[PDB]
Design a protein around this ligand. Structure first.
Ligand code: CHL
Ligand code: CHL
Ligand code: CHL
Ligand code: CLA
Ligand code: CLA
Ligand code: CLA
Ligand code: CLA
Ligand SMILES: CCCCCCCCCCCCCCCCCC(=O)OC[C@H](CO[C@@H]1O[C@H](CO)[C@H](O)[C@H](O)[C@H]1O)OC(=O)CCCCCCCCCCCCCCCCC
Ligand SMILES: CC1=C[C@H](O)CC(C)(C)[C@H]1/C=C/C(C)=C/C=C/C(C)=C/C=C/C=C(C)/C=C/C=C(C)/C=C/C1=C(C)C[C@H](O)CC1(C)C
Ligand SMILES: CC1=C[C@H](O)CC(C)(C)[C@H]1/C=C/C(C)=C/C=C/C(C)=C/C=C/C=C(C)/C=C/C=C(C)/C=C/C1=C(C)C[C@H](O)CC1(C)C
Ligand SMILES: CC1=C[C@H](O)CC(C)(C)[C@H]1/C=C/C(C)=C/C=C/C(C)=C/C=C/C=C(C)/C=C/C=C(C)/C=C/C1=C(C)C[C@H](O)CC1(C)C
Lengths: 220, 238, 219
């Protein structure tokens, strides 16, 4: 499987000879030929959208792992005052604050405003450095800088670099899809992802999403 | 300059100045006599060109093409949907024993243990599994749309929007190029009306909570009494 | 400067390589913020500039119109419904929508006629805005002047430029603030001025995070 060039894998498979636009040359990772809406016809808008895709992908991978991990650790024994991810933020308003792994001695956060303030300070610093560089880079690539972000050195060969780019963007698209799912099915179900999987495995035919289909009907 | 019967619209097959109101420079525009500077890329060559690109989203010709295809496909799906969201309710108020004719509740019929009888007749489709329904549908519509986007058993070297072989123009209504050109406009206009009315169905569901024909009926009962402003305070933040 | 290459930018010092090649410091408010690349085409850029400025002007008017009645409300005027996100429901009251509380001023009773007149006049004026009319056969789509400058503030090009920047910046501020009005009316259910009063009463406890667990599904 090629992942590049004209004979690359495409998002409709065999159905995909004449659907791909002329501007989606197999140059960039994850180019399956999906621009039915034509939103990436301009190469500059295409570059900006590629950056958005990759950053959303990386953030979504981190977030998918961060929503899965505490729940797994929650049933595997560990105290998690609020393990479910869509209420993990409301721990600040509890009696003992947000203890990290349940340990009252680890972080013991009590004020959300100060937490948020530090977060804006350092996130702004880091994202500005990401845009225009800084202590970990001056004129590197906006997406794959390397140097300080390859302490292991996985991608010094261009072919390994390309295949790992594809792996990155695909795990990331998977994570973005899965995070969208987390959102919609938290809103719909009101339970965690792991508990949704447990319930689906307990009764797959009558514990699926269609059980929550008549939930949002107006009914006067 | 003409005679009475040509003013009255007689003598079909006199149509080359009747495309002038739907194609070309001096056509009808989105604000009529109050839309002066149409976007230069909306030259009047495509059907439904009223000069409306206030947001400039179709400035690139290729994304304009993709948006045209999106528009027409949405239009066709919305026409089918606008017809299908009113046919069951009309048929039920005429007396067909449909168990849930309201469209935003029509999907919940498959969870009743009598199944999803089509016209309320158990001898008909009688679907019980929504998952099997969805699987059949996914297989068929995937084949169907993949055939649409590149070609398939119903013609491969055809247009992406108006294939018009013997499978999609089997009545030959569009063999006259002028009839074709004006039928394109009729298609896109009925379809834009259907898309607007389907947005209306969606909003009238989320807001009103009744069927669309029920809304029509309660509006025709006492219009000034009952309107969309009746439900204006419904989404009050409490 | 607010123009040219050495202009103020959206990320300040960390903004040298974060601006596209097409965002030359030609237009007001160009801080170099097109991370999404939505204005790469100059024509789409022009249309988006018009949308920005019109949204800005409408949002300034609306911000003032949501702040003013509430101020006047506690300052001593009754205002049957002073809060802005229920100011429209006054038509369904007993005496209709009285402007400043005065039953003698407007005394509007029908919302459909109000709306009809509004569509009439608004369509006329917005079509005149797009293609001109009694107040401008051939002017700029955004800064026409010549009847929209009875005071004549912007006959000098430099004053014109700086007032353009001031306009678009007050307008971006108002658009942000109006978005805030929306989200925090939906979240809080109270007016903007009352939200400020409550924040000033106890800033550390009745900030937005007090309403954070409001939209949790909880099965
Ligand atoms: C030939 C068979 C084949 C078919 C039919 C498809 C079809 C698809 N592939 Mg694809 N692929 C196929 C082969 C292959 N794919 C891929 C690799 C990929 C990738 C990497 C990706 C795809 C994606 C897609 C999707 C893009 C179209 C879309 O977004 O649907 C849009 C239409 C719908 C979503 C309609 C909904 C369908 C369903 C009936 C929904 C049910 C309706 C709900 C009840 C409605 C809810 C009600 C609400 C409103 C209240 C689509 C499902 C993309 C994707 O996953 O996006 C989703 C994608 O990223 N494919 C490979 C490897 C080379 C293939 C090998 O042959
Ligand atoms: C092989 C089976 C096949 C089937 C069952 C369908 C079925 C459908 N196609 Mg379809 N197509 C099929 C092959 C193909 N189509 C298309 C190109 C299109 C287009 C461009 C459109 C359809 C649409 C449709 C729908 C309306 C049919 C119609 O116009 O009725 C009249 C008789 C229907 C779901 C329409 C649609 O989905 O709108 C809702 C639509 O716009 N098809 C091509 C490429 C030429 C095909 C190649 O084999
Ligand atoms: C060097 C420091 C510096 C930093 C870090 C920034 C940062 C920013 N400036 Mg900038 N500026 C900076 C210097 C300067 N600025 C300006 C002039 C301007 C202007 C005119 C504007 C900006 C704007 C912006 C923002 C654009 C990116 C954005 O939209 O945020 C995106 C990132 C976030 C929104 C993160 C949010 C943080 C927080 C954690 C969110 C909370 C999460 C929620 C709880 C989750 C939501 C819950 C859901 C589920 C409901 C960004 C915050 C723009 C702006 O105000 O947009 C908002 C803008 O219009 N700046 C000048 C004058 C020359 C500067 C001088 O140094
Ligand atoms: C790969 C990602 C992924 C995975 C593994 C799951 C897994 C699950 N989801 Mg989630 N979900 C996802 C993505 C995912 N979802 C996305 C993207 C959305 C937004 C559309 C949702 C929205 C959603 C809702 C609203 C609900 C679930 C629910 C569920 C559970 C029951 C399955 C179900 O009802 O199907 C629903 C699946 C979808 C709506 C779309 C996902 C599309 C899949 C990945 C592709 C089809 C693969 C499938 C095996 C092929 C079936 C063919 C045919 C039958 C159609 C199950 C644990 C339900 C739950 O909590 O039950 C306990 C529930 O209420 N999900
Ligand atoms: C009023 C709506 C309308 C109009 C005027 C047109 C007009 C046209 N279409 Mg479009 N089309 C529409 C709706 C419409 N279509 C919808 C909703 C679909 C999706 C089902 C399509 C799918 C479609 C395809 C795939 C193709 C066309 C083609 C054509 C052209 C020739 C056929 C024709 O004149 O039909 C005139 C339309 C009527 C006389 C309306 C009849 C009313 C029906 C029968 C009502 C009942 C609906 C039925 C029960 C639903 C099941 C389907 C012409 C430009 C072909 C073309 O351009 O090739 C040259 C072509 O290939 N159209
Ligand atoms: C609808 C209102 C609106 C519109 C159309 C624009 C449009 C524009 N802005 Mg403005 N802007 C706005 C609101 C708006 N802005 C507000 C409220 C702020 C303050 C936060 C700014 C602050 C701002 C700065 C600081 C700069 C711009 C710039 C630009 C231009 C390039 C970016 C672009 O194409 O965005 C297109 C915008 C849209 C397609 C709107 C999408 C809206 C979605 C729903 C997201 C909004 C939700 C948020 C959470 C373009 C003319 C840059 C420029 O070149 O100046 C001329 C620039 O430097 N804007
Ligand atoms: C400059 C504009 C502006 C100003 C002066 C305020 C001021 C206020 N807001 Mg509003 N708000 C704004 C913009 C603004 N907001 C926008 C753009 C949003 C949408 C994200 C919101 C969403 C919002 C909500 C949901 C709530 C408030 C609330 C409040 C009050 C408490 C402060 C708080 O919780 O911070 C919240 C601030 C934000 C969520 C974002 C604003 C970003 C600021 C301007 C930048 C950071 C500056 C620091 C000092 C306070 C009166 C709360 C309230 O009513 O308490 C009484 C409340 O529940 N605001
Ligand atoms: C899409 C699927 C389309 C094919 C559906 C086949 C149904 C198979 C089946 O079980 O049918 C079963 C059905 C009978 O089934 C009966 O249906 C009735 C309603 O029609 C009632 O619901 C009864 O309860 C039920 O017993 O058999 C037929 O109807 C086939 C007879 C065909 C008569 C029309 C011939 C005219 C054809 C020429 C005109 C067109 C050119
Ligand atoms: C391609 C194409 C083509 C054509 O042309 C057109 C179109 C169609 C348009 C296109 C498409 C597109 C799409 C589909 C998109 C999607 C997106 C997504 C899904 C995203 C996500 C995304 C996602 C994401 C970011 C995510 C993220 C996450 C995160 C951060 C997390 C966080 C967290 C966590 C951990 C948990 C805790 O407790 C808390 C919190 C804080 C919560
Ligand atoms: C032009 C312009 C210009 C400027 O520049 C910019 C702008 C403004 C942006 C633009 C505009 C645009 C617009 C307006 C759009 C719209 C759209 C729509 C409305 C769609 C719909 C759309 C719609 C649609 C598809 C619809 C569809 C439907 C369907 C399928 C149906 C289905 C069904 C039915 C039958 C019933 C049953 O029981 C169920 C169901 C299942 C439900
Ligand atoms: C720049 C950029 C860049 C990159 O590239 C991309 C992106 C990111 C996309 C972009 C961004 C954008 C944005 C942020 C936007 C925003 C917007 C807004 C906020 C608007 C507002 C807007 C706003 C507005 C109009 C407002 C308006 C207002 C009004 C009318 C008002 C009215 C009223 C009032 C007085 C009150 C009373 O009782 C009633 C009523 C009737 C209610």
């Amino acid at each position: 499987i090629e992942w590049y060039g004209p004979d690359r894998p495409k998002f409709l498979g065999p159905f995909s000879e004449g659907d791909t636009p002329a501007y989606l040359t197999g140059e960039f990772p994850g180019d399956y030929g999906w621009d039915t809406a034509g939103l990436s016809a301009d190469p500059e808008t295409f570059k900006r959208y590629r950056e958005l895709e990759l950053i959303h992908a990386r953030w979504a991978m981190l977030g998918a792992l961060g929503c899965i991990t505490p729940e797994l650790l929650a049933k595997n024994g560990i105290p998690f005052g609020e393990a479910v991810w869509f209420k993990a933020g409301a721990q600040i308003f509890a009696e003992g604050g947000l203890n990290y792994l349940g340990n009252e001695n680890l972080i013991h956060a009590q004020s959300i405003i100060a937490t948020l303030a530090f977060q804006v300070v350092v996130m702004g610093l880091a994202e500005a450095y990401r845009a225009n560089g800084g202590p970990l880079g001056e004129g590197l690539d906006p997406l794959h800088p390397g140097g300080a972000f390859d302490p292991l050195g996985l991608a010094d060969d261009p072919d390994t670099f390309a295949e790992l780019k594809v792996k990155e963007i695909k795990n990331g698209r998977l994570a973005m899809f899965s995070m969208f799912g987390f959102f919609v099915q938290a809103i719909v179900t009101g339970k965690g992802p792991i508990q949704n999987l447990d319930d689906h495995l307990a009764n797959p035919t009558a514990v699926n999403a269609f059980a929550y289909a008549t939930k949002f009907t107006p009914s006067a | 300059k003409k005679t009475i019967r040509e003013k009255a619209g007689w003598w079909s097959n006199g149509g080359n100045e009747k495309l002038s109101a739907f194609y070309g420079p001096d056509r009808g525009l989105w604000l009529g006599p109050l839309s002066g500077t149409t976007p230069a890329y909306l030259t009047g060559e495509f059907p439904g060109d009223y000069g409306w690109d206030s947001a400039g989203l179709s400035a690139d010709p290729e994304t304009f093409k993709r948006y045209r295809e999106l528009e027409l496909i949405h239009a066709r799906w919305a026409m089918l949907g606008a017809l299908g969201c009113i046919t069951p309710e009309l048929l039920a108020k005429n007396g067909t024993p449909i168990v849930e004719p309201v469209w935003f509740k029509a999907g919940a019929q498959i969870f009743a243990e009598g199944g999803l009888d089509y016209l309320g007749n158990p001898g008909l489709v009688h679907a019980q599994s929504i998952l099997a329904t969805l699987a059949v549908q996914v297989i068929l519509m995937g084949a169907i749309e993949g055939y649409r986007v590149n070609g398939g058993p119903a013609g491969e070297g055809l247009d992406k929007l108006h294939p018009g072989g013997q499978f999609f123009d089997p009545l030959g209504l569009a063999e006259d190029p002028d009839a074709f050109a004006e039928l394109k406009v009729k298609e896109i206009k009925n379809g834009r009306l259907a898309m607007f009315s389907m947005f209306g169905f969606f909003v009238q569901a989320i807001v009103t909570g009744k069927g669309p024909l029920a809304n029509l009926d309660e509006h025709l009962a006492s219009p000034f009494t009952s309107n969309a402003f009746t439900y204006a305070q419904k989404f009050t933040p409490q | 400067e607010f123009y040219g290459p050495n202009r103020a930018k959206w990320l300040g010092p960390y903004s040298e390589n974060a601006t596209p090649a097409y965002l030359t410091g030609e237009f007001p408010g160009d801080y170099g913020w097109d991370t999404a690349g939505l204005s790469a085409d100059p024509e789409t850029f022009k249309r988006y500039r018009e949308l920005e400025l019109i949204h800005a002007r409408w949002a300034m008017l609306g911000a003032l119109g949501c702040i003013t009645p509430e101020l006047l409300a506690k300052s001593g005027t009754q205002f049957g419904e002073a809060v802005w996100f229920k100011a429209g429901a006054q038509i369904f009251s007993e005496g209709g929508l009285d402007y400043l509380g005065n039953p003698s001023l407007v005394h509007a009773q029908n919302i459909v006629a109000t709306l009809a007149v509004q569509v009439i006049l608004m369509g006329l004026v917005e079509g005149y805005r797009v293609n001109g009319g009694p107040a401008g056969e051939g002017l700029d789509p955004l800064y026409p002047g010549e009847s929209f400058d009875p005071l004549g503030l912007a006959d000098d090009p430099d004053t014109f430029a700086e007032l353009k920047v001031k306009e678009i910046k007050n307008g971006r501020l108002a658009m942000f603030s109006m978005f805030g009005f929306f989200v925090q009316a939906i979240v809080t259910g109270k007016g903007p001025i009352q939200n400020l009063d409550d924040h000033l009463s106890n800033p550390t406890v009745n900030n937005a995070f007090a309403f954070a667990t409001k939209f949790t599904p909880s099965a």
